[PDB]
Amino acid sequence: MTEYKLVVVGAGGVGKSALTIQLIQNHFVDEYDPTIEDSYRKQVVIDGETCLLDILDTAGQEEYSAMRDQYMRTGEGFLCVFAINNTKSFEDIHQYREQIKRVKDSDDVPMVLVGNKCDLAARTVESRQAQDLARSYGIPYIETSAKTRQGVEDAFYTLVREIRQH
């Protein structure tokens, strides 16, 4: 069956792990345990196609920035996550995109921009700002909450549908 290699990237604490765990295991991780690098696999049906999602959950802590080149090499599509209550995590997106762009030597890498924690009211990144960033990359913007599950499947499935346009 078709295998899709997804990689979830973004600053520390934006909810990369919570998003992936919500998708794969259907519960919300409330505590914060910083990730080094974890892998998840699950067979799903997306638009009538049975496929395997291989998801790499990466480190947001800058300490582990050295490991980025390896995972950017292998991944087929990237979920670029920031938190809507964390302006710095939004500003950090470009450095993730730029590295992906260098490594793939492509301006057309399948990606989705994800604004997570949309359940929180302390918003400092407005949807329109994020829409504009995504537009400049030629990719979709989707808001999510790993807490409520809002948008979680849409984000990952959209990344699959982007990989399929490439």
Ligand X SMILES: Nc1nc2c(ncn2[C@@H]2O[C@H](COP(=O)(O)OP(=O)(O)NP(=O)(O)O)[C@@H](O)[C@H]2O)c(=O)[nH]1
Binding site for GTP: which residues?
A: 13-18, 29-35, 59-60, 116-119, 145-147
CA within 13 Å, CB half, 37: 13
Judged by CB under 6 A, how many residues of this single chain contact ligand X? 23
User: Is residue 115 a contact point for ligand X (CB under 6 A)?
Assistant: no
Distance (Å) of CA 29 to CA 68, 86, 155? 24, 19, 18
Distance (Å) of CA 109 to CA 8, 15, 163? 14, 22, 8
Among Ca ion, Mg ion, ligand X, none, what does residue 47 contact (CB within 5–8 Å per kind)?
Answer: none
Q: What is the binding site for Mg ion (CB under 5 A)?
A: 16-17, 35
Q: Token pair of 107, please?
A: 């301006």
Give the orientation angle of helix 127-137 with respect to helix 87-104, to 10 degrees. Answer: 10
Shortest reach from residue 9's CB to ligand X, in Å: 9
User: Is residue 14 a contact point for ligand X (CB under 6 A)?
Assistant: yes
Residues engaged in binding ligand X (CB under 6 A)? 12-18, 29-32, 34-35, 59-61, 116-117, 119-120, 145-147
